Write the structure tokens for this entry.
Amino acid sequence: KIKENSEKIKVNKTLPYLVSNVIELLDVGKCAVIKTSTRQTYFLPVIGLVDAEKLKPGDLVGVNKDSYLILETLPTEYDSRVKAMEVDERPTEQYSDIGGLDKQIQELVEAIVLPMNHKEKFENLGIQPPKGVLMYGPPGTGKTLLARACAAQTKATFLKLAGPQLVQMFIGDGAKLVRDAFALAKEKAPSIIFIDELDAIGTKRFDSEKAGDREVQRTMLELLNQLDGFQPNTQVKVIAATNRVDILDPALLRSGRLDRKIEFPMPNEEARARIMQIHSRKMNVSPDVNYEELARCTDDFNGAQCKAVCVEAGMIALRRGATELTHEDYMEGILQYYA
Amino acid sequence: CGKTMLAKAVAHHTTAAFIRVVGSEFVQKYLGEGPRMVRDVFRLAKENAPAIIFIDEIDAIATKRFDAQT
Amino acid sequence: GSSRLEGGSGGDSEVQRTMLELLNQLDATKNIKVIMATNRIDILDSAL
Amino acid sequence: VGEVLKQLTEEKFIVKATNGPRYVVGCRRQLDKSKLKPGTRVALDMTTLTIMRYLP
Amino acid sequence: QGVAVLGIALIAMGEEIGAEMALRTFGHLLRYGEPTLRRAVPLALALISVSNPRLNILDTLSKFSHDADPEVSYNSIFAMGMVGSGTNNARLAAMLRQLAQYHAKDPNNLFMVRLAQGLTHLGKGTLTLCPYHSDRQLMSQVAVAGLLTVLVSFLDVRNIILGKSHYVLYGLVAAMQPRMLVTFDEELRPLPVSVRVGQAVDVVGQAGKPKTITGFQTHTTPVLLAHGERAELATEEFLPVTPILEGFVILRKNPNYD
Amino acid sequence: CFMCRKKVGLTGFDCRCGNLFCGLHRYSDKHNCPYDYKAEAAAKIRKENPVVVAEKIQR
Amino acid sequence: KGCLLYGPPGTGKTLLARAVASQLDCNFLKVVSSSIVDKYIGESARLIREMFNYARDHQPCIIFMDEIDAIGGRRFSEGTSADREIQRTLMELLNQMDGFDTLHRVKMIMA
Amino acid sequence: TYSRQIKQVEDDIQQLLKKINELTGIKESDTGLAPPALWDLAADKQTLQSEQPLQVARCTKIIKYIINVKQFAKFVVDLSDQVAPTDIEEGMRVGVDRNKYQIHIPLPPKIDPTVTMMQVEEKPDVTYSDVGGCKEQIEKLREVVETPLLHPERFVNLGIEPPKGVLLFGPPGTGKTLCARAVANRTDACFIRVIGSELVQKYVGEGARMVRELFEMARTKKACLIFFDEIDAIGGARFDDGAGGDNEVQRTMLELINQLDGFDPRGNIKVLMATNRPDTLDPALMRPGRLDRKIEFSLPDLEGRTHIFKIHARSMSVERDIRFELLARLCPNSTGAEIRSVCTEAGMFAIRARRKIATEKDFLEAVNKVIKS
Ligand SMILES: Nc1ncnc2c1ncn2[C@@H]1O[C@H](COP(=O)(O)OP(=O)(O)OP(=O)(O)O)[C@@H](O)[C@H]1O
Ligand SMILES: Nc1ncnc2c1ncn2[C@@H]1O[C@H](COP(=O)(O)OP(=O)(O)OP(=O)(O)O)[C@@H](O)[C@H]1O
Ligand SMILES: Nc1ncnc2c1ncn2[C@@H]1O[C@H](COP(=O)(O)OP(=O)(O)OP(=O)(O)O)[C@@H](O)[C@H]1O
Ligand SMILES: Nc1ncnc2c1ncn2[C@@H]1O[C@H](COP(=O)(O)OP(=O)(O)OP(=O)(O)O)[C@@H](O)[C@H]1O
Ligand SMILES: [Mg+2]
């Protein structure tokens, strides 16, 4: 009749196990101090269908709305849609197709992947892996490129920056988004956190303009805490991205927080040639190209402008349905008195 | 300067009922309990005829009207 | 009687609404007389 | 869970339940009324709401 | 009285304001009328708005199709099917299926509602019977003949149809006709062309050359227009042989100048 | 590990030919990368392309 | 009853805190200025008084505020509802540090 | 004569209407049911079988599934006559009934009123062939906005990326808004105008939200054409200096850019950026990876002026014969808007002459007046 006991336990555990917090544990056997959505506080001398030890103050557990007995616990929850934003459909690009930039990719790939895969070398050397990384995209050229290309490893998760400033005017909160984000990263396997447009946060922290400022400073300080506090934070990899290089928080700055601040320079002639080649790889280019001389014509054509120009050249040829490069209608796609 | 002793020292030296209040511990919870609890403490003070109602610094409340708002 | 500005501007049911009602009632007085008084002229209402 | 507020007579106490309402209830005998005091927490029962067990 | 109201409808079928207000009068009749006049009104409503499922008329027809009187309900349900004839409007179909659900225990009503969905889906909304024609200018004699036969038959739905004879719907089928804009050019060549289609605007009187197109929806040649929308073709691509574009048309390939 | 330089660098960029090219010779123009870049472009663009159906056909 | 740790960004403050926490071996409460909450009202002071009550019950204890800059702010007047709430939270801290909440066996750290 | 006949017959109509009202009597007062009948007993019964609440489902834990629901009362429920388990989605609007709380009907996502009415589903009343003086610009816009949509297999065969992002700029008033309206009317895709002012709110948090919901709405829709106007208002130079308090607009602009092109595909959304001062525009936004085919509207030439003139002359009551090329010649350096205002002035001059014909003389007088002012 043990089975019959199990089935009747199941049936009396109908289904709508109203979920409740596990706010506190005690003993006298152990007990529970659960709290419910409907603000209430139930002491349970008998906790219920749980080991009464895996519980820990702060947890979500199903409960019988009437019996108030802790039923099957549920995995922790993450709010502010941190979980929803923390998704990624394995960005399709597989190669590191960027262009001339080589040292930047070198250091970033090393400091990120090598700890992940070949941590054997690090442990043998007795070295904790490289510290949190920053990646200056002053113009943005190649910034998201490197991020997305890095989104081609074996398997991991990437926490994008998306509205950490989602704070209520009425004081708001110290980036509960940040709290939940770091919690999720901590709980999941080796994870990475791409702080996009980090400039949106971060500052000298002393300017006293007005409200909203101070909210941004609490969020910043929450970031600082999340990686500099009484926490090893071993299983995390922060990669920051910013363009307002100069104006940023001196503490957020580096040295346990954002080290190895890779820099994105203006592509040289070779780099411009390489990027235009990369974007033209799939282009139906005729067997006649002056790629290098087009790179020379670039004349400070750093950013995605190369991609935009290849697209505009495609449309230009498509005026007439061709597959060849005029090489000068290409400059006019690029874009009196004396002369 | 030493306001808080003068407070505590009279709270001891006195031979009368005394009630201490915090500057702003009466603003919390669902809407509308602040007025209720302030009138409650004043009712208790009335009940204790020789009552002395000391409140810690006030600045966090009553500093300004802050004009009409919503 | 604070200067009519900031929020509400007639969309608020507060002292601004009371000011609007007062102005509507005023205009008309025949022989009654009204003496407003204040410490500072800085704050004033154009409508009033 | 709710904290007692006053030792009303002997078998009567005013307890403000955390959910918000304030009640007056009597306590099971085996509770050493001396123990509980203004501010002490207690676990009232569902139906009758008699003080069953004081808590720290 | 039923035939009298049907004749009021059979006199008012053209002028848009007159038809709208004939519907208003028929609503007056149904509300302050005998049960006979009540059964009669929905048929006249269908006559006025054939294949023209406007929201107000649909509301009224559903209103007086959920009526207690079975004959009133029959007339109203079939009238609503007719006003939805060959339109496939989502709102109309949803209302229709809800009414079918409600009349779950009524066999004849369920039959009629099934025919109502069939009407809403005529040729999957490709064939639309219409007395009027040619921008509300031409009178369809055969169409009016068939429609009047059907509606006279439905004047007494209980005996005429719920019984031996139910093929006046086939008479209506014969009366059917499409609404379509194949631009089959010279030698029936299916020359395609971009056409801007929009609800008519009653060009008379307005300023300049009124934009008969409301909500320009350039949709090539194989379009179906609608109960009351017309086309303007394009800037100067071709020269249509008719300015009332409808059905089989020819487009002279002689633009004055590109 | 591309033939020029016989490079084995961990940074080695691993291309659609699965080959950690020389840092300076990672490009298809340089190493005759035998991949159908253009065909993949056509397929992907066809998949992702939005087409306006004019929203007139209906059941 | 309290100590302060003037420090630029990384002088050794948090690691110092770790070392003292592992050394003393009594109760430790490492708390951060990211304790601000809002439910159409303020409860930061309530959380603060919960902290202080916990400590007083666990008399032997080291509370450690860190990043006191944020909540510490300043007594700005007529700033905004946010400024008033933050200064109220600060004021709870002041009242429960000094005042009738006088302690005997707890120790406070700031950085 | 005719006027008096009107007045009489409209008097008859007003009398008839008041007579109907007084005779029969239909009114509402407070709430009403003017439409006869409306009996809804079955509606009540099914309402009882329904009248459900809704919340936001969170997670389906197990593979009988465990849906998690949050509102003023948390819950963990599942199962329903509804199928397509959670419609292969979690963060929807569940729409679950009471009474054991296991029966559901999916619902669309809640969106703030701002974006709800910014959807602007109306179709502006403009069409091509009503545009003169910017034939090249309209050609570019037509290409970019239509070729990817109209018979676009030819646009994919070449293995060329589909351009996405166009910024219209030029002097104040050149037919940019007119061309935007024309494209909106002609297009058949989820069109969404945007007003910059509606993105500026009380302190941080508002603009970024509304932008994100707008973007996810566009993504949910099959294919979107978004039509930002007032870009000069929304988004500017990133420099702070004294904007340390005004950084809210810059923040919102930053989120806008990230959604335009960040660490995620942006989708089949084509952006139109209306402006007339294309210099203060922020470099990050102006990056051609987000505004591919910037278009410049210039003052019309003589032929464009003439074409706009005849377009505006489309209206009736105009002269039988006018000589539009000379009209354009007399008005050089004139915007198409100024051509429109010249036609308006000619009409007003005809009225102020009590003339029902707009003569070339009227056009000349209007041109003289506008030139002098
Ligand atoms: N070196 C590069 N290789 C490939 N694509 C590039 C490169 N530089 C720019 N791009 C193009 O730029 C777009 C991605 O933006 P990118 O990563 O350069 O950041 P950004 O938008 O300029 O950043 P920021 O926010 O700092 O302005 C894509 O179109 C990508 O093709
Ligand atoms: N007369 C005094 N004798 C001794 N200590 C004093 C005296 N006045 C002030 N103090 C010092 O300050 C404290 C008493 O003042 P306390 O700081 O409690 O209140 P306060 O000076 O009014 O300022 P606050 O209200 O901001 O705390 C004591 O702890 C002592 O260190
Ligand atoms: N004096 C030090 N001796 C040894 N390691 C140190 C020292 N200071 C910092 N570190 C290293 O830096 C990290 C801890 O930083 P630290 O405790 O100095 O931060 P902090 O001063 O609290 O920073 P912040 O002021 O920016 O909030 C650990 O990696 C620790 O090894
Ligand atoms: N190419 C054109 N064809 C016809 N009318 C035109 C043309 N260009 C301008 N107009 C006239 O000018 C006015 C168009 O103003 P619109 O709002 O479209 O301009 P804009 O370029 O967006 O700039 P602005 O907002 O500064 O006026 C209307 O009067 C329109 O008739
Ligand atoms: Mg304009």
Q: What stands out?
A: The radius of gyration of chain D is 10 Å. DSSP finds no helices and five strands in chain D. Residues 8 and 15 of chain D are 10 Å apart (CA to CA).
